[PDB]
Write a protein that holds these residues in place. Structure first.
Motif, PDB file in Angstrom:
ATOM      1  N   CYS C 124       0.697  -1.186  -0.170  1.00  0.00           N
ATOM      2  CA  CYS C 124      -0.092  -0.013   0.185  1.00  0.00           C
ATOM      3  C   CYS C 124       0.781   1.316  -0.099  1.00  0.00           C
ATOM      4  O   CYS C 124       0.349   2.283   0.190  1.00  0.00           O
ATOM      5  CB  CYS C 124      -0.866  -0.124   1.368  1.00  0.00           C
ATOM      6  SG  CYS C 124      -2.265  -1.172   0.974  1.00  0.00           S
ATOM      7  N   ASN C 125       2.131   1.193  -0.197  1.00  0.00           N
ATOM      8  CA  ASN C 125       3.081   2.545   0.323  1.00  0.00           C
ATOM      9  C   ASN C 125       3.411   3.193  -1.151  1.00  0.00           C
ATOM     10  O   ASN C 125       3.880   4.225  -1.069  1.00  0.00           O
ATOM     11  CB  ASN C 125       4.309   1.783   0.724  1.00  0.00           C
ATOM     12  CG  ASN C 125       4.957   1.022  -0.080  1.00  0.00           C
ATOM     13  OD1 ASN C 125       4.536   0.546  -1.231  1.00  0.00           O
ATOM     14  ND2 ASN C 125       6.531   1.161  -0.061  1.00  0.00           N
ATOM     15  N   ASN C 126       2.893   2.938  -2.350  1.00  0.00           N
ATOM     16  CA  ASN C 126       2.792   3.781  -3.235  1.00  0.00           C
ATOM     17  C   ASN C 126       1.905   4.890  -3.496  1.00  0.00           C
ATOM     18  O   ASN C 126       1.068   5.185  -2.655  1.00  0.00           O
ATOM     19  CB  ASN C 126       2.269   2.815  -4.614  1.00  0.00           C
ATOM     20  CG  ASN C 126       3.223   1.630  -4.778  1.00  0.00           C
ATOM     21  OD1 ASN C 126       2.718   0.352  -4.127  1.00  0.00           O
ATOM     22  ND2 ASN C 126       4.423   1.528  -5.049  1.00  0.00           N
ATOM     23  N   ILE C 127       2.204   5.673  -4.661  1.00  0.00           N
ATOM     24  CA  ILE C 127       1.347   7.005  -4.727  1.00  0.00           C
ATOM     25  C   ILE C 127      -0.028   6.790  -4.957  1.00  0.00           C
ATOM     26  O   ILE C 127      -0.899   7.528  -4.325  1.00  0.00           O
ATOM     27  CB  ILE C 127       1.948   7.783  -5.899  1.00  0.00           C
ATOM     28  CG1 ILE C 127       2.002   7.205  -7.130  1.00  0.00           C
ATOM     29  CG2 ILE C 127       3.421   8.414  -5.278  1.00  0.00           C
ATOM     30  CD1 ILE C 127       2.456   7.961  -8.052  1.00  0.00           C
ATOM     31  N   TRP C 128      -0.578   6.076  -5.715  1.00  0.00           N
ATOM     32  CA  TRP C 128      -2.032   5.765  -6.154  1.00  0.00           C
ATOM     33  C   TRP C 128      -2.582   5.322  -4.859  1.00  0.00           C
ATOM     34  O   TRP C 128      -3.937   5.201  -5.095  1.00  0.00           O
ATOM     35  CB  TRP C 128      -1.929   4.851  -7.181  1.00  0.00           C
ATOM     36  CG  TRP C 128      -1.405   3.492  -6.816  1.00  0.00           C
ATOM     37  CD1 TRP C 128      -2.019   2.483  -6.302  1.00  0.00           C
ATOM     38  CD2 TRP C 128      -0.129   3.122  -7.499  1.00  0.00           C
ATOM     39  NE1 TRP C 128      -0.979   1.426  -6.166  1.00  0.00           N
ATOM     40  CE2 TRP C 128      -0.090   1.748  -6.981  1.00  0.00           C
ATOM     41  CE3 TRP C 128       0.883   3.578  -8.408  1.00  0.00           C
ATOM     42  CZ2 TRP C 128       1.270   1.084  -7.263  1.00  0.00           C
ATOM     43  CZ3 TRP C 128       2.048   2.702  -8.499  1.00  0.00           C
ATOM     44  CH2 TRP C 128       2.272   1.561  -8.116  1.00  0.00           C
ATOM     45  N   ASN C 129      -1.949   4.766  -3.791  1.00  0.00           N
ATOM     46  CA  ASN C 129      -2.728   4.463  -2.712  1.00  0.00           C
ATOM     47  C   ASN C 129      -3.346   5.240  -1.735  1.00  0.00           C
ATOM     48  O   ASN C 129      -2.887   6.578  -1.760  1.00  0.00           O
ATOM     49  CB  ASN C 129      -1.701   3.424  -1.839  1.00  0.00           C
ATOM     50  CG  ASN C 129      -1.317   2.133  -2.489  1.00  0.00           C
ATOM     51  OD1 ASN C 129      -0.115   2.135  -2.952  1.00  0.00           O
ATOM     52  ND2 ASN C 129      -2.346   1.352  -2.806  1.00  0.00           N
ATOM     53  N   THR C 130      -4.260   4.912  -0.982  1.00  0.00           N
ATOM     54  CA  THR C 130      -4.991   5.800  -0.068  1.00  0.00           C
ATOM     55  C   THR C 130      -4.727   5.067   1.536  1.00  0.00           C
ATOM     56  O   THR C 130      -4.424   4.094   1.445  1.00  0.00           O
ATOM     57  CB  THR C 130      -6.409   5.614  -0.333  1.00  0.00           C
ATOM     58  OG1 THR C 130      -6.920   4.535   0.024  1.00  0.00           O
ATOM     59  CG2 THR C 130      -6.698   6.103  -2.019  1.00  0.00           C
ATOM     60  N   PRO C 131      -5.112   6.110   2.234  1.00  0.00           N
ATOM     61  CA  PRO C 131      -4.853   5.642   3.767  1.00  0.00           C
ATOM     62  C   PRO C 131      -5.916   4.699   4.163  1.00  0.00           C
ATOM     63  O   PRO C 131      -5.648   3.926   5.133  1.00  0.00           O
ATOM     64  CB  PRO C 131      -5.532   6.863   4.584  1.00  0.00           C
ATOM     65  CG  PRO C 131      -5.183   7.910   3.559  1.00  0.00           C
ATOM     66  CD  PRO C 131      -5.766   7.366   2.160  1.00  0.00           C
ATOM     67  N   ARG C 134      -5.724  -1.481   2.163  1.00  0.00           N
ATOM     68  CA  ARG C 134      -5.662  -2.796   2.890  1.00  0.00           C
ATOM     69  C   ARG C 134      -4.739  -3.716   2.295  1.00  0.00           C
ATOM     70  O   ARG C 134      -4.697  -3.771   1.147  1.00  0.00           O
ATOM     71  CB  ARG C 134      -6.809  -3.378   3.607  1.00  0.00           C
ATOM     72  CG  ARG C 134      -7.609  -2.554   4.696  1.00  0.00           C
ATOM     73  CD  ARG C 134      -6.618  -2.297   5.839  1.00  0.00           C
ATOM     74  NE  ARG C 134      -7.256  -1.274   6.725  1.00  0.00           N
ATOM     75  CZ  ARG C 134      -6.878  -0.072   6.792  1.00  0.00           C
ATOM     76  NH1 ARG C 134      -6.258   0.255   5.913  1.00  0.00           N
ATOM     77  NH2 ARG C 134      -7.477   0.957   7.762  1.00  0.00           N
ATOM     78  N   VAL C 138     -10.360  -6.612   2.774  1.00  0.00           N
ATOM     79  CA  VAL C 138     -11.402  -6.416   3.933  1.00  0.00           C
ATOM     80  C   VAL C 138     -12.455  -6.222   3.162  1.00  0.00           C
ATOM     81  O   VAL C 138     -12.602  -5.105   2.509  1.00  0.00           O
ATOM     82  CB  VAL C 138     -10.863  -5.228   4.757  1.00  0.00           C
ATOM     83  CG1 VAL C 138     -10.424  -4.099   4.068  1.00  0.00           C
ATOM     84  CG2 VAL C 138     -11.662  -4.872   5.759  1.00  0.00           C
ATOM     85  N   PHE C 144     -12.843   1.060   2.190  1.00  0.00           N
ATOM     86  CA  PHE C 144     -11.366   0.220   2.477  1.00  0.00           C
ATOM     87  C   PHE C 144     -11.347  -0.744   1.368  1.00  0.00           C
ATOM     88  O   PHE C 144     -11.808  -1.883   1.323  1.00  0.00           O
ATOM     89  CB  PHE C 144     -11.235  -0.334   3.717  1.00  0.00           C
ATOM     90  CG  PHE C 144     -11.392   0.794   5.154  1.00  0.00           C
ATOM     91  CD1 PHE C 144     -12.426   0.823   5.289  1.00  0.00           C
ATOM     92  CD2 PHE C 144     -10.099   1.444   5.188  1.00  0.00           C
ATOM     93  CE1 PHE C 144     -12.836   1.852   6.406  1.00  0.00           C
ATOM     94  CE2 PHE C 144     -10.410   2.248   6.431  1.00  0.00           C
ATOM     95  CZ  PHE C 144     -11.833   2.514   6.839  1.00  0.00           C
ATOM     96  N   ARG C 154      -7.433   2.742  -8.993  1.00  0.00           N
ATOM     97  CA  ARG C 154      -6.699   3.784  -8.795  1.00  0.00           C
ATOM     98  C   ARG C 154      -5.728   4.395  -9.993  1.00  0.00           C
ATOM     99  O   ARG C 154      -5.013   5.296  -9.823  1.00  0.00           O
ATOM    100  CB  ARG C 154      -6.211   4.358  -7.493  1.00  0.00           C
ATOM    101  CG  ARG C 154      -7.398   4.284  -6.483  1.00  0.00           C
ATOM    102  CD  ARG C 154      -6.914   5.008  -5.133  1.00  0.00           C
ATOM    103  NE  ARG C 154      -7.720   6.058  -5.226  1.00  0.00           N
ATOM    104  CZ  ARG C 154      -6.877   7.429  -4.929  1.00  0.00           C
ATOM    105  NH1 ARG C 154      -5.635   7.200  -5.082  1.00  0.00           N
ATOM    106  NH2 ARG C 154      -7.509   8.836  -4.923  1.00  0.00           N
ATOM    107  N   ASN C 160     -11.345   6.420 -10.481  1.00  0.00           N
ATOM    108  CA  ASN C 160     -11.270   7.268  -9.307  1.00  0.00           C
ATOM    109  C   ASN C 160     -11.388   8.572  -9.643  1.00  0.00           C
ATOM    110  O   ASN C 160     -12.007   9.689  -8.983  1.00  0.00           O
ATOM    111  CB  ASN C 160     -10.285   7.078  -8.088  1.00  0.00           C
ATOM    112  CG  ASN C 160      -9.147   7.193  -8.880  1.00  0.00           C
ATOM    113  OD1 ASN C 160      -8.704   7.019 -10.034  1.00  0.00           O
ATOM    114  ND2 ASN C 160      -7.823   7.814  -7.879  1.00  0.00           N
ATOM    115  N   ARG C 161     -10.853   8.842 -10.839  1.00  0.00           N
ATOM    116  CA  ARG C 161     -10.958  10.359 -11.515  1.00  0.00           C
ATOM    117  C   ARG C 161     -12.003  10.697 -12.225  1.00  0.00           C
ATOM    118  O   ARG C 161     -12.070  11.828 -12.746  1.00  0.00           O
ATOM    119  CB  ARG C 161      -9.663  10.470 -12.006  1.00  0.00           C
ATOM    120  CG  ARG C 161      -8.343  10.553 -11.487  1.00  0.00           C
ATOM    121  CD  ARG C 161      -7.071  10.718 -12.402  1.00  0.00           C
ATOM    122  NE  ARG C 161      -5.881  10.604 -12.131  1.00  0.00           N
ATOM    123  CZ  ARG C 161      -5.013   9.809 -11.132  1.00  0.00           C
ATOM    124  NH1 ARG C 161      -5.796   8.391 -11.131  1.00  0.00           N
ATOM    125  NH2 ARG C 161      -3.999   9.960 -10.553  1.00  0.00           N
TER     126      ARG C 161
END
Ligand SMILES: CC(C)CCC[C@@H](C)[C@H]1CC[C@H]2[C@@H]3CC=C4C[C@@H](OC(=O)CCC(=O)O)CC[C@]4(C)[C@H]3CC[C@]12C
Ligand SMILES: CC(C)CCC[C@@H](C)[C@H]1CC[C@H]2[C@@H]3CC=C4C[C@@H](O)CC[C@]4(C)[C@H]3CC[C@]12C
Ligand SMILES: OC[C@H]1O[C@H](O[C@H]2[C@H](O)[C@@H](O)[C@H](O)O[C@@H]2CO)[C@H](O)[C@@H](O)[C@@H]1O
Ligand SMILES: OC[C@H]1O[C@H](O[C@H]2[C@H](O)[C@@H](O)[C@H](O)O[C@@H]2CO)[C@H](O)[C@@H](O)[C@@H]1O
Ligand SMILES: OC[C@H]1O[C@H](O[C@H]2[C@H](O)[C@@H](O)[C@H](O)O[C@@H]2CO)[C@H](O)[C@@H](O)[C@@H]1O
Ligand SMILES: OC[C@H]1O[C@H](O[C@H]2[C@H](O)[C@@H](O)[C@H](O)O[C@@H]2CO)[C@H](O)[C@@H](O)[C@@H]1O
Ligand SMILES: OC[C@H]1O[C@H](O[C@H]2[C@H](O)[C@@H](O)[C@H](O)O[C@@H]2CO)[C@H](O)[C@@H](O)[C@@H]1O
Ligand SMILES: *[C@@H]1O[C@H](CO)[C@@H](O)[C@H](O)[C@H]1NC(C)=O
Ligand SMILES: NCCc1ccc(Cl)c(Cl)c1
Ligand SMILES: [Cl-]
Ligand code: NA
Ligand code: NA
Lengths: 219, 214, 535
Positions: C124-131, C134, C138, C144, C154, C160-161
């Motif tokens: 999940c640590n890339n730029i396209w990722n969100t907080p 998961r 989940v 999520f 994304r 998402n755009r």
């Protein structure tokens, strides 16, 4: 009037055991059945268990059944949940609620206590200042920041100037990446205020006993 | 287990409009045993509607609910900013007790361009061996926003932590925190780092770039 | 009288096998068995396959070989009143080509992105990722996603755009290149006709079975693999009671064998008159359904692996459509050793699964138009160039940021439930107007023997009854189109109905048209339209 306060809870390692308590007041406690409802980090509500008014009728979810034991003390007005062999999926914020009348639902909930189950271990956060690029921008407003990185577990308390200015402050929620939390914050103020006045970032991480107050220097 | 699925998952609404969320159960549920809960962000849930119809104490008349069997719905006649929350339907008909998936009600406002600010790695971090560039995007609508990270003309995807905020109780805009993490070595090998705001508010990306020259 | 034939017998078989076996085999059938309670679903699937599915598969291959002409001309020479059927069937394949090839493009795009040891959909640590990102699965919904889900949504799609189908957004040129590559591959295969097309399917049809075997071994070699097979074939027979399980088996059996696309009609039109179609019809039917059954293990062996080691509910990891192949499955692949290898062959298999299937769709249009318009036959190289250009340019809508919303619209409305009414008219037109006895008389002259009365009963009675009624009960359960949390506008749903209806309406359209064109008495004009070529 009625008040419910969940106590206990914290970081426990997988397989470990912990018990949570719920303080009840403002109503006759023995007259109302109680239940435990937990909310996952994905924010979905899941009923755990229900104890009767006399505690003679118990109900559990198929997930926690036999691992969790819900007790009741009507003398001191305290509700208990004793867990065991905890697993990583048991991580959530546990709520104490009643729960007496099945047709009217749960009419009272508590503040809630947070339980975190992971093999990870506590580490103090590192707070870094956010200073805008040298020279450059001159405008009616300016944005500073405070970076709290590499801490665990939640929560942390971040305030600006001991909570003097809450306006123009955006504190972003922490994001867990590889057993570490990262939390930042942004504060916008007029250029006449700074750096003609002291702007500091107050971060508190009770888990590691870490209290750090640090000003932002343009240097 | 009796599952309760709520839709929509997320709902944006202008104040004064009416909104309706649905709750459907896998197994039939007595209309007397189904309830609704409203939970404000960072707060505890609250009993909203019980027995599918009757409102709880304190709930304004603008709220209502209906339905029977496997189908139920909650409806707000005139929505207000104070009504923004996540609502959970539930069934007590049988154990285990089960909450619905929930509906997240967010207010909708005029589109606002993000205010972007880029920051260089702190000196105290560089001594620790790590270097992390932070970029803030504040007060914009809607929430969806996208960020490239360029340590050079090239783009770097890996090692980035984005954090969205919740809905502002006043201006109803949002904010994002994007953090690009590097080693004290990898960071000092390059000079000009670039951040961005790619948003609905513009065809061009909002760019914030800093160099280690200054 | 002189018409080219397959350079080899295997060319036709692999062409039909290739067209018949598609992503639908991997996508749905395994999932259908899970939801429908395992090997118990085989009953309604097998029952509908036996009475409804195969006999109609047999009918097209028979009609195609005997009449020796394209889909349009074939129904013109059979029942000139119903010749509108030939138009309805062909332009349906014309619609499908728009939204189908993008799936192959997605396969290639994932394939291109598949060179690395570190797969971009892992963490999940890339730029396209969100907080809200998961690790695996989940929920969901809502709110999520996963690393494999966010990477696809994304980044690849960048859906998402987009706020809906009304906003397509910017055009992704990496997809445009992929979509171009897809149509390019389709172009040089059909470039010279069935000459090259015949020996091209030797790969596209066969290759998937190679990867199927590899992923089958690798799948059953993993922990909790047997657990997934349980959710797959576990025999709960109470599922037969539901009305929808029969319409799914029906719609699955029909879409899987692909009758009513005029493809079987075209492919069989290049067969030799005395070639045995009945043998080919049986063999091909089996291989398709067998491939599905096999693929069921491949998916759930891996799905079971996620529900054991990866700590996720089998409930959330069991899915149909592109979500399974472009999200869930790659997520399971990312964890296991030598992941880069499995990913490459998998996506390549997805592409080779869609290609030979798309070939039949294209050929159905080309062959049908070629027999109608000799001007196209000599110019065919130039003709198929423009047709695909139309597909690519229009297909650019599929390459937009909201492209998936456009895809899901055609995936829904473009071809379905029309094939049922289209095939329904095919059965009735043949068994009733043209007649069963005259049709069986044709098969006798071809393969040497008339069809058993079992086949004749299905054509005349069973099929039309198990079509008309199931096609009706699908209209009762009709939901206005919605994807995820997004709900398509009322005008969007209407646009799809025009697409689905534009074919079916051709039945009465050309019927009434040719009916008023013919000089004579009404009853005579009717007789003129019900008479075959030399009859
Ligand atoms: C691969 C698995 C997962 C599903 C396979 C299903 C088959 C076992 C079923 C579905 C269709 C059935 C067939 C449908 C048509 C006929 C009718 C009947 O044909 C005849 O009357 C004789 C043929 C002739 O000479 O005319 C003999 C059985 C047979 C081949 C059936 C044999 C069993 C079949 C192949
Ligand atoms: C299920 C998986 C694991 C194994 C499948 C093996 C493959 C290679 C099998 C399955 C079906 C088989 C095909 C079915 C029948 C024919 C017709 C014959 O005239 C040419 C060979 C050909 C085309 C076969 C080639 C081999 C084949 C493709
Ligand atoms: O964007 C340029 C091309 O590479 C992209 O990303 C790849 C590439 O290897 C690199 O950006 C990085 O390693 O991530 C992935 C896989 O490694 C995409 O493949 C496309 O945009 C382009 O082909
Ligand atoms: O491309 C070089 C090889 O490694 C790639 O992945 C790495 C690599 O360092 C580089 O492409 C880029 O930085 O992305 C990651 C992380 O650095 C891929 O594995 C393949 O392209 C190559 O094996
Ligand atoms: O959406 C992916 C990004 O690139 C795409 O394609 C263009 C785009 O104009 C931009 O990235 C860059 O200037 O060129 C690429 C193709 O080379 C999208 O069009 C962009 O919106 C995105 O930034
Ligand atoms: O009605 C939708 C609007 O956007 C679409 O997409 C186009 C359009 O030209 C515009 O949004 C943008 O500049 O380009 C995209 C494709 O790149 C429609 O095509 C437009 O008619 C509308 O403005
Ligand atoms: O319901 C008929 C319409 O949709 C169908 O597509 C699917 C879909 O899942 C659902 O509508 C229903 O279950 O039918 C099938 C799956 O069984 C038809 O394919 C469409 O042509 C109809 O518009
Ligand atoms: C990728 O790296 C992992 C971890 O080192 C290793 O186990 C695996 O074999 C590698 N895969 C490939 C295809 O190189
Ligand atoms: N799913 C097999 C049927 C099918 C597949 C692809 C196409 Cl392009 C067509 Cl027309 C028909
Ligand atoms: Cl199938
Ligand atoms: Na198929
Ligand atoms: Na195929």
């Amino acid at each position: 009037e009625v008040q419910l306060v969940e106590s206990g809870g914290g970081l426990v390692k997988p397989g470990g055991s912990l018990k949570l308590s719920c303080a009840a007041s403002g109503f006759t406690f023995s007259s109302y059945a109680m239940s435990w409802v937990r909310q996952s980090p994905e924010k979905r509500l899941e009923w755990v268990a229900e104890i009767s008014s006399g505690g003679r009728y118990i109900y559990y979810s198929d997930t926690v059944t036999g691992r969790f034991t819900i007790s009741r003390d009507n003398a001191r007005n305290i509700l208990h949940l004793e867990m065991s062999s905890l697993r990583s999926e048991d991580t959530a914020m546990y709520y104490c609620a009643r729960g007496e009348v099945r047709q009217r639902g749960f009419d009272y909930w508590g503040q809630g206590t947070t339980l975190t189950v992971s093999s990870a271990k506590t580490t103090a956060p590192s707070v870094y200042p956010l200073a805008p690029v040298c020279g450059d921008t001159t405008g009616s407003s300016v944005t500073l920041g405070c970076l709290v990185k590499g801490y665990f577990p939640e929560p942390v308390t971040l305030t600006w100037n001991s909570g003097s200015l809450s306006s123009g402050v955006h504190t972003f929620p922490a994001v867990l990446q590889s057993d570490l939390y990262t939390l930042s914050s942004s504060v916008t103020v007029t250029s006449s205020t700074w750096p003609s006045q002291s702007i500091t970032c107050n971060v508190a991480h009770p888990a590691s006993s870490t209290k750090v107050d640090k000003k932002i220097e343009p240097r | 287990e009796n599952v309760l699925t709520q839709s929509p998952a997320i709902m944006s609404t202008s104040p004064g409009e009416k909104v309706t969320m649905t709750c459907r159960a896998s197994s039939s549920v007595g209309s007397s045993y189904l309830h609704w809960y409203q939970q404000k962000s960072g707060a505890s849930p609250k009993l909203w509607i019980y027995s599918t119809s009757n409102l709880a104490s304190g709930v304004p008349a603008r709220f209502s609910g209906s339905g029977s069997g496997t189908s139920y719905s909650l409806t707000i006649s005139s929505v207000e900013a104070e009504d923004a929350a996540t609502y959970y339907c539930q069934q007590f008909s049988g154990y285990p007790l089960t909450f619905g998936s929930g509906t997240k009600l967010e207010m909708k406002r005029a589109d606002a361009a993000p205010t972007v600010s880029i920051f260089p790695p702190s000196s105290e971090q560089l001594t620790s061996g790590g270097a992390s560039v932070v970029c803030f995007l504040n007060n914009f609508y809607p929430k969806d926003i996208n960020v490239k990270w360029k340590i050079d003309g090239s783009e770097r995807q890996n090692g980035v932590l984005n954090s969205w905020t919740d809905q502002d109780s006043k201006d109803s805009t949002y904010s994002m925190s994007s953090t690009l993490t590097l080693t004290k070595d990898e960071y000092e090998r390059h000079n000009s780092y670039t951040c961005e705001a790619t948003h609905k508010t513009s065809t061009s990306p909002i760019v914030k770039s800093f160099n280690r020259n200054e | 009288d002189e018409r080219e034939t397959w350079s080899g017998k295997v060319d036709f078989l692999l062409s039909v096998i290739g067209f018949a076996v598609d992503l639908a085999n991997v996508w749905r059938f395994p999932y259908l068995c899970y939801k429908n309670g395992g090997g118990a679903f085989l009953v309604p699937y097998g029952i509908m396959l036996a009475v409804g599915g195969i006999p109609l598969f047999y009918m097209e291959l028979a009609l195609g070989q005997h009449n020796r002409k394209g889909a349009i001309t074939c129904w013109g020479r059979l029942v000139p009143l119903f010749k509108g059927i030939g138009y309805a069937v062909v332009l349906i394949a014309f619609y499908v080509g728009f939204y189908y090839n993008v799936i192959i493009a997605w396969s290639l795009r994932f394939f291109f992105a598949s060179f690395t040891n570190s797969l971009p959909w892992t963490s999940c640590n890339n730029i396209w990722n969100t907080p809200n990102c998961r690790p695996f699965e989940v929920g969901h919904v809502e709110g999520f996603q996963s690393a494999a889900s966010e990477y696809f949504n994304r980044y690849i799609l960048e859906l998402n755009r987009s706020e809906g189908i009304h906003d397509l957004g910017a055009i992704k040129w990496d997809m445009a290149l992929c979509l171009l590559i897809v149509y390019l591959i389709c172009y040089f295969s059909l470039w010279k006709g069935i000459s090259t097309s015949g020996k091209v399917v030797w790969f596209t049809a066969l290759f998937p079975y190679a990867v199927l075997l590899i992923l089958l071994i690798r799948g059953l070699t993993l922990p909790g693999s047997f657990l997934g097979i349980q959710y797959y074939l576990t025999p709960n027979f109470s599922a037969i009671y539901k009305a929808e399980v029969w319409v799914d088996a029906a719609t699955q059996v029909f879409f899987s064998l692909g009758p009513g696309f005029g493809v079987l009609l075209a492919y069989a039109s290049y067969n030799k008159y005395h070639n045995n179609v009945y043998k080919d019809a049986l063999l091909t039917s089996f291989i398709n359904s067998a491939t599905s059954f096999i693929a069921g293990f491949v998916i759930f062996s891996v799905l079971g692996y996620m529900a054991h080691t990866l700590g996720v509910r089998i409930e959330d990891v069991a899915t149909e459509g592109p979500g399974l192949v472009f999200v869930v499955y790659p997520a399971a692949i990312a964890t296991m050793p030598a992941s880069t290898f499995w990913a490459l062959i998998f996506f390549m298999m997805l592409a080779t699964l869609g290609l030979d299937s798309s070939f039949g769709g294209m050929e159905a249009i080309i062959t049908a138009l070629s027999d109608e318009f000799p001007k196209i036959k000599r110019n065919r190289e130039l003709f198929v160039a423009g047709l695909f250009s139309l597909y690519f340019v229009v297909g650019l809508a599929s390459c937009t940021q909201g492209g998936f919303y456009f895809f899901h619209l055609l995936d829904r409305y473009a071809a379905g439930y029309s094939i049922l009414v289209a095939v329904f008219f095919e059965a009735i037109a043949v068994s009733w107007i043209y007649g069963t006895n005259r049709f069986s008389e044709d098969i006798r002259d071809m393969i040497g023997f008339p069809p058993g009365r079992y086949w004749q009963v299905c054509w005349r009675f069973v099929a039309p009854i198990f079509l008309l009624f199931i096609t009706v009960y699908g209209l009762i359960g009709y939901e206005p189109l919605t994807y995820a949390d997004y709900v398509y506008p009322s005008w969007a749903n209407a646009l799809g109905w025009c697409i689905a209806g534009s074919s079916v309406v051709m039945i009465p359209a050309v019927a009434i048209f040719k009916l008023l064109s013919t000089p004579g008495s009404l009853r005579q004009r009717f007789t003129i339209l019900t008479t075959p070529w030399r009859d």
